[PDB]
Structure 1
Amino acid sequence: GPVWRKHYITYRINNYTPDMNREDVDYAIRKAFQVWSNVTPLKFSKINTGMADILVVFARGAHGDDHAFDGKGGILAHAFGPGSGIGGDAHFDEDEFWTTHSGGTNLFLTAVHEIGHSLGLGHSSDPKAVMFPTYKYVDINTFRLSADDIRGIQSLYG
């Protein structure tokens, strides 16, 4: 599938969930990108204006991309594979309650998974992979990609 054909990738936080402190949104997203820069040649930079490669959006219900969100539960987030325009973008359902911890839905863990899609990864059948289709909290301070995730991302980059 499509992959970014450049090493410097930009993101922008379009808007911020009221569920969290701003600095904690910034940090969770930054750390999630770092999970992937750690195992690829990719470098990620947050920009504050202009067109980023990866636009990060919190939105609810129908939000302009034909993939409406569904209220609390169910779909938590989705992201588009590499490409121009909407490609790469990562959208988080505002009807979830995003957090820095095990309460609500953990934004960092969700973003690691979504960014994997923004980089071109699909889903893994391994429950230990971050790219497994199902959300489950794991301690975020000791989080590590599975061997399956590493094999997937290194099949695309590096």
Structure 2
Amino acid sequence: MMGPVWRKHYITYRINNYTPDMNREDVDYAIRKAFQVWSNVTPLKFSKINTGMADILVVFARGAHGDDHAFDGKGGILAHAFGPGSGIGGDAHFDEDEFWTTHSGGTNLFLTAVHEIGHSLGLGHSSDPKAVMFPTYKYVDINTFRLSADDIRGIQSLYGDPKEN
């Protein structure tokens, strides 16, 4: 059986704080485009809010940061996220000890967020090294990036595919 799902289509996110590694606008853009990857294949729609309680909180932090999953310094775990639910449910956390970038150096924020949001929507890891839900990081350019068949099958068995027209 698989884990619980969001039981609505309009889902909100809030960026709690920004990493200083990147331009603030680029954080915004990378996160929006990572949600779009998943919006493109489901009926889910994501919007950013700046106040109010959001479904998905995006956090940058080092070490312990208030949940049961203290980060571990540079390398190791890069980020983690919680599956659908209230409260900490759906939240996505990125380790500030990594160096977050818009490019092939350090750790690419966009690619990392697509994986984390995969978790936030209910997915687990894939055994396919081409899947974005493969557990370890491997850079691919934002332009060439595509969800694998396995990523699509996974997300569509949870939410359906849309819906158009």
Q: Deviations over 1:19-67 (max 9, x none)?
A: 0001100000000000000000000000000110000000000000010
Deviation of 1:86 after TM superposition, in Å, equals: 0.1
Structure 1 Cα separation of the partners of residues 108 and 143 of structure 2: 12
Q: Tell me, what secondary structure is at the counterpart of 2:72? A: coil
Deviation of 1:8 after TM superposition, in Å, equals: 0.1
Deviation of 1:110 after TM superposition, in Å, equals: 0.2
The equivalent residue for 1:61 is 63
TM-score by length of 1: 0.99
Deviation of 1:141 after TM superposition, in Å, equals: 1.5
Deviation of 1:154 after TM superposition, in Å, equals: 0.5
Q: Deviations over 1:53-87 (max 9, x none)?
A: 00000000000001000000000000000000000
Q: Deviations over 1:102-136 (max 9, x none)?
A: 01000000000000000000000100000000100
The equivalent residue for 2:149 is 147
Q: Tell me, what secondary structure is at the counterpart of 1:141? A: coil
Structure 1: 5+ residue stretches without partners: none
The percent identity for this pair of structures is: 100
Deviation of 1:140 after TM superposition, in Å, equals: 1.1
Q: Tell me, what secondary structure is at the counterpart of 1:44? A: strand
Q: Deviations over 1:85-111 (max 9, x none)?
A: 000000000000000000100000000
Structure 2 Cα separation of the partners of residues 122 and 130 of structure 1: 11
Q: Tell me, what secondary structure is at the counterpart of 2:143? A: helix
Deviation of 1:139 after TM superposition, in Å, equals: 1.0
TM-score by length of 2: 0.95
The equivalent residue for 1:106 is 108
The number of aligned residues is 158
Structure 1 Cα separation of the partners of residues 93 and 30 of structure 2: 14
The equivalent residue for 1:89 is 91
Structure 1 Cα separation of the partners of residues 67 and 57 of structure 2: 13
